[PDB]
Amino acid sequence: HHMASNTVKITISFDNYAYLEGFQTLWGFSCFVETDETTFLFDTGSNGRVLLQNMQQLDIDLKKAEALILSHPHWDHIGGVDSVLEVHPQMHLFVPNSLSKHLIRDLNAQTLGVTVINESPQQLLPSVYSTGVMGDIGEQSIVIDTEKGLVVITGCAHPGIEHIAARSIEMLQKPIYLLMGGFHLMYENTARISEVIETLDELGIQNVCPTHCSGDLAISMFKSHFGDRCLQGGIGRVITI
Amino acid sequence: SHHHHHHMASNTVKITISFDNYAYLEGFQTLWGFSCFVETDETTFLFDTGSNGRVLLQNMQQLDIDLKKAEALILSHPHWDHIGGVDSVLEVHPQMHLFVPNSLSKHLIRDLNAQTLGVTVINESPQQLLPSVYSTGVMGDIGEQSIVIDTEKGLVVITGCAHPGIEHIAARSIEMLQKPIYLLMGGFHLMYENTARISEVIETLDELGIQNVCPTHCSGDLAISMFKSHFGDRCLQGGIGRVITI
Numbered sequence: 001h002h003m004a005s006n007t008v009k010i011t012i013s014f015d016n017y018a019y020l021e022g023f024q025t026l027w028g029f030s031c032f033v034e035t036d037e038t039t040f041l042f043d044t045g046s047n048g049r050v051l052l053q054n055m056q057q058l059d060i061d062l063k064k065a066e067a068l069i070l071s072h073p074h075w076d077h078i079g080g081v082d083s084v085l086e087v088h089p090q091m092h093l094f095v096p097n098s099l100s101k102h103l104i105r106d107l108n109a110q111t112l113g114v115t116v117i118n119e120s121p122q123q124l125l126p127s128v129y130s131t132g133v134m135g136d137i138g139e140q141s142i143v144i145d146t147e148k149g150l151v152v153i154t155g156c157a158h159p160g161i162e163h164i165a166a167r168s169i170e171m172l173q174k175p176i177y178l179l180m181g182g183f184h185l186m187y188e189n190t191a192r193i194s195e196v197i198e199t200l201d202e203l204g205i206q207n208v209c210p211t212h213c214s215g216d217l218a219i220s221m222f223k224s225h226f227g228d229r230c231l232q233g234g235i236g237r238v239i240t241i
Numbered sequence: 242s243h244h245h246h247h248h249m250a251s252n253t254v255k256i257t258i259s260f261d262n263y264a265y266l267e268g269f270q271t272l273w274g275f276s277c278f279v280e281t282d283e284t285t286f287l288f289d290t291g292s293n294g295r296v297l298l299q300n301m302q303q304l305d306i307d308l309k310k311a312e313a314l315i316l317s318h319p320h321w322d323h324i325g326g327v328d329s330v331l332e333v334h335p336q337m338h339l340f341v342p343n344s345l346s347k348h349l350i351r352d353l354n355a356q357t358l359g360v361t362v363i364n365e366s367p368q369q370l371l372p373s374v375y376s377t378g379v380m381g382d383i384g385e386q387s388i389v390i391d392t393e394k395g396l397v398v399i400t401g402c403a404h405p406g407i408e409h410i411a412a413r414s415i416e417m418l419q420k421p422i423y424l425l426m427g428g429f430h431l432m433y434e435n436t437a438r439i440s441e442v443i444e445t446l447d448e449l450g451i452q453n454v455c456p457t458h459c460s461g462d463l464a465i466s467m468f469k470s471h472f473g474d475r476c477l478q479g480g481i482g483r484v485i486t487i
């Protein structure tokens with residue numbers, strides 16, 4: 001009994017892992033989201049020239065995108081904004097208040113307008129919600145409401161992947177079908193990661209797709225724990241809900 | 242069997258402001274950030290890349306700056322409005338050497354190494370980078386380097402946003418090379434200082450003997466006005482398209 005999404009197609013378009021041959025791996029994250037109600041870009045990687053190149057090689061039509069959502073102000077997620085907005089300025093933007101006011105001003109003058117998200121969760125597009133800005137760095141994740149459950153996407157997940165999972169489940173009172181993105185576990189030891197995994201098991205996370213800054217150790221442990229419920233990420237990966 | 246040596250000081254230096262939130266010439270899009278195209282006797286380099294690499298390349302075309310004659314790219318510090326144009330510059334002209342502060346992400350340094358002629362990572366010690374061109378070394382909490390150009394008229398010190406304090410960057414430069422400062426230019430980060438401390442900054446720069454200033458970018462209109470009242474013609478107008486000849 002929800003106003004959920006019919007089909008959701010997520011394409012990783014920038015990553016430091018490669019799911020497909022023919023793509024330059026670089027540090028950063030970005031993914032292209034197509035639903036039956038909206039189309040949007042989530043983050044822009046560290047390099048907008050490679051990002052545009054990746055999208056041409058993936059047959060991603062950037063001009064079909066209605067909105068650009070930014071997770072947090074780090075170089076490896078806003079590094080492609082200028083290249084994206086040059087070719088497709090007619091977009092509404094959704095950014096966290098952690099972003100420089102100078103940048104927010106420049107973006108407003110270039111696009112259909114910038115919505116600034118605060119600590120309060122908020123719907124952005126049909127079936128697409130922001131967690132609100134969390135953590136000291138000031139990061140927002142996006143929650144997509146689908147028939148199979150929630151799909152949560154994070155940039156580097158600085159506030160803690162388990163706090164973002166729990167925030168999303170509170171917002172919409174549905175379980176999480178897919179938790180994906182960068183988890184920022186690359187500097188953590190084995191013990192800590194097993195605690196995170198088992199908290200994600202308590203919350204009932206059904207599938208995960210850790211990539212970007214998640215860490216080789218964490219990704220391996222996630223794989224051995226979730227098995228086939230742990231999806232291979234990287235540039236060119238396509239996930240359909 | 243003939244020997245060849247670089248000059249210690251450059252006889253002529255030409256500095257072109259190619260990205261700024263002030264405009265000196267008509268018909269350029271101001272945006273928050275800074276970039277400088279520097280031509281010396283023996284080398285040509287970029288100092289920072291603004292916040293928007295597409296606008297940066299457009300500004301450089303309109304200014305008849307050929308990016309491809311630049312031998313090096315120097316980054317002052319990791320803020321979005323100074324590294325925002327790096328990817329656009331390296332796509333058209335990757336055959337450059339890079340000089341970056343150690344406050345840059347090691348992930349970003351790794352990526353820049355694979356795409357360029359190589360990255361030199363500056364630490365806390367001052368360091369020569371090019372003929373007549375030195376870095377102060379990484380200063381401040383954010384980790385910002387400024388460049389000191391050795392000229393036959395004295396030192397030309399260029400700064401991105403000057404987070405460590407413009408008076409400390411001035412003093413460091415003078416310690417480095419034991420020459421007076423002919424020109425101190427760039428963003429001085431004096432935007433939210435009251436007139437009382439802008440005044441003690443100004444007279445510290447007077448005691449250091451700064452001969453000319455060009456505050457721009459994040460300097461602040463309050464400070465810029467006090468600077469232009471104190472220095473008169475020795476305070477130069479900044480902005481896109483401003484060409485300073487030494």
Ligand SMILES: [Mn+2]
Pocket residue numbers: 072074155156158
């Ligand atoms: Mn991050």
Ligand SMILES: [Mn+2]
Pocket residue numbers: 028029074076077155156182212213
């Ligand atoms: Mn990241």
Ligand SMILES: [Mn+2]
Pocket residue numbers: 318320402404
């Ligand atoms: Mn700065």
Ligand SMILES: [Mn+2]
Pocket residue numbers: 274275320322323401402428458459
């Ligand atoms: Mn700045």
